Design a binder for this molecule. Structure first.
Ligand code: DKA
Lengths: 247, 39, 281, 238, 247, 39, 247, 39
């Protein structure tokens, strides 16, 4: 026979192993394949679709009210309207999005993100806003004069209802980590803030409070690594009917 | 190399790098040009 | 539109822009299309040859992991009397369930691994038999009934001292793919079960200890793991947010307090201008 | 140019002067069942114009506190016109669908509706382990209403519902949404009375609002089956 | 030597495995093969042979009386004569047939079936019958006007004694399952009914009650999958003589 | 590959797809034509 | 299957074995390599860099004072200034050097060594010294007349501040061993001594005591064999925080 | 021979005999000639 010897690792069951194994039903002929719409081959395809950010995650906002940010006609100038924590590992507005949910099944990420906002006020409502992305290092800006120094886009409401703010991949290291320490140098992405560039201006018969819906998605320069179990689901008991499957 | 007679017994197939994100990201009948106004 | 992608896309350097009639940063979400604004059009970029790989997100790898699908403890002694029957399903353990439910349809072969452990109420090296009983076939009623002769059913005999038993179940749906979700009823009458496609019915896994009982009792636990392979997936879906309630449906209630409460999925912050983990220097 | 559109099928036609292009689900287009994918061996009937045409359902009213509406296909049309008759007399059916959702207001109104076509939208019930019953699911032409649109009545989320074929009706921008749906199933044909391939959901993410004269603002749905085929002829299960 | 490691599955005994194994009698020379009539290579060959359906499975019918359906001269018109449950998994007229018995060793099936009926009345007896196959969805038809809307064949008694009703494969899915729930959408095949098209008419000296024998078989577009133990045989004790084999 | 010296020790032979149902379905001396009256 | 048999050694875990093993994270894409200054591929590259010998390893000399040898203006002739034990296995001036530290992770060595001395007195200070290497066999020389008979270099202080004494590989055997017995014929390297050739002579305003710094390094004809754990580090308890890694 | 699909699973690579001690021993901008006075 062939002289052999067993190596360490012999007999183990590694859940991520990749080997062939005995077919339970020999000569089984699987059902012929049929074309089906919407085939997905890489999860990166899914995270490139923009989904709604829960920006209004505040007490008093219930259900869908949490998915839109209301802006009103201002009495003062250069007013701060809202900011968005760029936390993906820690809970925040970006967590329950396609990019957020899928990324959380991984530990490392790299690539540009894009935030698109759709103005949902009336046709007669006008306005200009400034959306800013502030690379990490300091405290979140609270004045337009400061936020304006970072990456930004000045948005004019009009026929084209939506604007896109690109959050370019600006990192020292190739990848960032979904680390539990939000202030870690290998995790903090910076901030996104929104201020009035001019003001929301509407006529008497148009509503004076209008909503914005913010979306986010990854660009095709995105990449995820180190698969892990997602912190978004768990169980402490048997689900109803689980035990009955044995009866 | 699969030594079993049934092909479904083989190890995983991790070589399909084909993608088409547009079926999810741009399912619009009329292609949207780069900087041209979408509407 | 389809193409082979092995690495993340490169970035090309860009210059200043001041062109009338050209507004790449403006879009119309109403069309249903995702923004096509490129980084190069939003800011001035440099050239970057991106070598980052994208293989770890291949569907085959994302779903290609052995996950727990069944766990059953029973008493091995003089009398579940030394055997059990499990109506196969992939909805009892939430980690695997949530991942499979990120897709509408799935076609795959399934590698099954069976791990057995024992505890005294030394440890005996018992022989077990796991028999696959397809739909319509008779299931065993006793540790010793004739059914175990397994003339046609596939059975696997393994010892507790051997590595976990393993075999592959082929893609066996009567359709071209399994229906992860099914918006319909399983029967021609109106009282049938909703959300359960008959087509995806596998059958029963019957497991018994072959050895006759010993003078003392033992607790035997059988864990079954499943790993999909040769995978094809269609129509991705919104991820589950509310805790699961039943293996038979998508019923929901939500946690008692955020996060993941029916009224609020994301935890609250003081206001829309409050930055949670603000850097204080 | 991509704001005006005319859809014509059979003896029916629809025009809109405020469209937002239109969606072709997963970049596909409806088609008849090819011989290499067929299963049922009887010669199918392909009625064409008598079934492949627009059927307009009863309208619904968009109110300040509306939670959203849904219609399942083919259930919503299983009792309408010749499409309904073919469905009742045949065990098997196959078809795509051209969906057109309509809603207009004034330049002083605001509001945004997510118009999404969900494949296999299996509903869940709220705060109970009992599965939804036949009457909770099969609403027919009237369609149903969302109890908790925030989680799409299935424990997931509307925030990520954009992963499905969709468009929006943002009053300030457009007054209609159009989605073309191809046959979507794991089988080449199916029994129309116990399974719904698609669910059309219309949800007001941004509520209807204005300070001008109040008027009833309806939302109307028109659906045209496409490339209809039927097999397994017998008596009607009317 | 060669470095190796044992994989999960090592040492197991899978009843459906396929490997070579040690020859007990080395250099043994098996008896030369000889041609023998009737070789069968695929079980599908066997189920294509038609066999008798036990249509008269009723109380009062004993033995062979259960294998024939008696039809009489009618006084009324368009009369229902009999129906046949198309149950293969559940007990019924089709269970103890070649196609039924062999199919029950499997779980999935696909293909057309054919039912042939031979009229066994006297030569002087005439008549016309209508055999109908009703695809699933509703209740079994009880009137000819309803049954007539499905697949059917009008049969005229004459020189050619038998008629064939083809039950074409009409299914949404590629295969159907032999599921214990007879009303399941993946199992119910529909119904077969038989009505007088005209009437059985015979002269005074011919018997006024005649028998039909119904047969069923699979066509060559048939296919079976997922082998399982048949529910048609079982034992609760040792057979006589089994234990004596050890004495 | 059978490593034993006796061929009967080899693994199963699941490659014989030859069939002739007619020896069971049509064992009649005179072939029956499609639609022509059998008698 | 393939007939096999397990050899002695089967199942063992040899810390120096070399085999492939199961990847924990399939399809993982490591971060792209980037050029980084100072790559080292063979440890021999490191020991060719000269480092400071602790020649003044005496009581009363603290810290850096131990790294320099002070020489003074002499009143007598041909005076012995210092000697250097060539012990590498036993503690001594050569132990905490690059060549010494790395060599101690091995058991056998071969090759030439080089000692370089830099005179750090003032510019106005002059002098001539003689550095001698005495191959093994006898007692360390204590007079210049005796030391002078071995390998040596006469050093004249001047513009070029440093001198090199080559300790050529002179051994009967191919290699020497780092044996605990310093007087063993397979370990003792001999001695290095330093005497005044003339005298250190300085003017009134220059310091009359000057320091030398001695360095040592291996040449490229060096070679090390038989890896072993170094005697230069050890622990008798858990390090602070080690156990906390489990909490 | 690595039978695993991921190259990082392979056995050790003990074949890189390239060296450049000078990056540590002679990192001076001007090469120092054999016997010529360094200064
Ligand atoms: C343990 C045997 C698993 C067989 C394959 C089951 C596929 C279930 C797919 C689903 O509906 O989620």
């Amino acid at each position: 026979g062939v002289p052999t010897y067993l190596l360490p690792g012999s007999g183990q069951f590694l859940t991520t192993d990749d080997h062939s194994s005995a077919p339970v039903l020999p000569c089984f002929n699987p059902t012929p394949e049929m074309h089906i719409p919407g085939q997905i081959r890489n999860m990166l395809e899914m995270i490139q679709v923009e989904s709604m950010m829960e920006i209004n995650n505040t007490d008093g906002a219930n259900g869908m009210e949490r998915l839109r940010v209301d802006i009103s006609v201002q009495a003062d100038l250069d007013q701060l309207l809202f900011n968005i924590p760029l936390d993906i590992q820690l809970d925040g507005p970006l967590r329950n999005t396609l990019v957020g949910n899928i990324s959380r099944y991984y530990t490392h990420w790299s690539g540009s993100l894009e935030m698109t906002f759709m103005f949902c006020g009336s046709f007669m409502a006008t306005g200009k806003l400034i959306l800013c992305y502030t690379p990490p290092g300091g405290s979140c800006p609270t004045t337009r004069e400061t936020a304006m120094l970072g990456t930004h886009i000045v948005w004019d409401f009009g026929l084209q209802s939506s604007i896109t703010l690109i959050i370019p991949w600006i990192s020292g290291s190739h990848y960032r980590m979904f680390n539990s320490d939000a202030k870690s140098t290998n995790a903090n992405v910076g901030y996104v803030t929104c201020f009035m560039q001019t003001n929301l201006i509407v006529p008497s018969e148009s509503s004076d409070t209008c909503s914005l819906i913010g979306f986010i998605a990854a660009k095709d320069d995105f990449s995820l690594r180190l698969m892990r179990d997602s912190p978004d689901i768990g169980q402490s008991n048997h689900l109803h009917g689980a035990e009955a499957a044995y009866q | 190399i699969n030594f079993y007679k049934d092909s479904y017994a083989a190890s995983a197939s991790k070589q399909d790098f084909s993608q088409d994100p547009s079926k999810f990201t741009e399912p619009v009948v009329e292609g949207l040009k780069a900087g041209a106004p979408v509407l | 539109v389809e193409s082979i992608i092995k690495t993340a896309t490169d970035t090309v350097k860009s210059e200043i822009n001041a062109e009338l009639g050209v507004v790449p940063s403006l879009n119309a979400v109403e069309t249903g299309a995702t923004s096509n604004t490129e980084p190069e059009e939003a800011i001035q970029t440099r050239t970057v040859i991106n070598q980052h790989g994208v293989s770890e997100t291949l569907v085959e790898n994302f779903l290609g992991r052995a996950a727990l699908v069944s766990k059953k403890s029973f008493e091995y002694k003089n009398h579940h009397k030394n055997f059990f029957k499990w109506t196969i399903n992939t909805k009892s353990f939430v980690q695997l369930r949530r991942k499979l439910e990120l897709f509408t349809y799935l076609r795959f072969d399934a590698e099954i691994t069976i791990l057995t452990t024992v505890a005294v109420n030394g440890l005996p090296d018992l022989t077990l038999q796991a028999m696959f009983v397809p739909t319509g076939a008779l299931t065993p009623k006793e540790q010793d009934s004739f059914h175990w002769q397994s003339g046609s059913n596939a059975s696997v005999f393994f010892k507790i001292s051997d590595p976990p038993a393993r075999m592959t179940i082929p893609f066996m749906c009567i359709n071209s793919a399994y229906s992860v979700f099914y918006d319909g009823f399983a029967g021609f009458e109106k009282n049938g079960l909703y959300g359960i496609n008959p087509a995806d019915t596998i059958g029963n896994l019957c497991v018994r200890i072959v050895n006759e009982h010993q003078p003392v009792g033992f607790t035997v636990t059988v864990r079954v793991y499943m790993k999909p392979k040769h995978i094809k997936a269609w129509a991705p879906r919104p991820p589950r947010t509310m805790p699961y309630m039943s293996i038979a449906n998508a019923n929901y209630k939500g946690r008692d307090t955020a996060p993941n409460t029916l009224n609020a999925i994301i935890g609250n912050r003081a206001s829309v201008t409050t930055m949670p983990h603000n850097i204080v220097t | 140019s991509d704001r005006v559109l005319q859809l014509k099928l059979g003896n029916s036609a629809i025009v809109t002067q405020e469209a937002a292009n239109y969606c072709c689900a997963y970049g596909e287009w409806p088609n008849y069942l090819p011989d290499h994918e067929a299963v049922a061996i009887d010669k199918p009937t392909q009625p064409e114009t008598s079934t492949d045409r627009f059927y307009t359902l009863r309208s619904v009213k968009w109110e300040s506190n509306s939670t959203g509406w849904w219609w399942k296909l083919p259930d919503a049309l299983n009792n309408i016109g010749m499409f309904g008759q073919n469905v009742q007399y045949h065990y098997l059916y196959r078809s795509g669908f051209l969906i057109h959702v309509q809603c207009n207001a004034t330049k002083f109104h605001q509001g945004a509706l997510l118009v999404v076509a969900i494949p296999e939208h299996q509903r869940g019930a709220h705060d109970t382990t009992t599965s939804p019953g036949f009457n909770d699911i099969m609403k027919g032409e009237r369609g149903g209403t969302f109890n908790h649109p925030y989680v799409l009545d299935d424990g997931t989320s509307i925030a990520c519902a954009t992963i499905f074929p969709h468009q929006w009706i943002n009053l300030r921008t457009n007054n209609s949404a159009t989605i073309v749906l191809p046959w979507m199933n794991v089988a080449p044909m199916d029994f129309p009375l116990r399974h719904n391939q698609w669910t059309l959901a219309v949800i007001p993410v941004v509520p209807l609002g204005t300070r001008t004269m109040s008027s009833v603002v309806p939302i109307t749905v028109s659906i045209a089956p496409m490339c209809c085929e039927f097999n397994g002829l017998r008596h009607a299960i009317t």
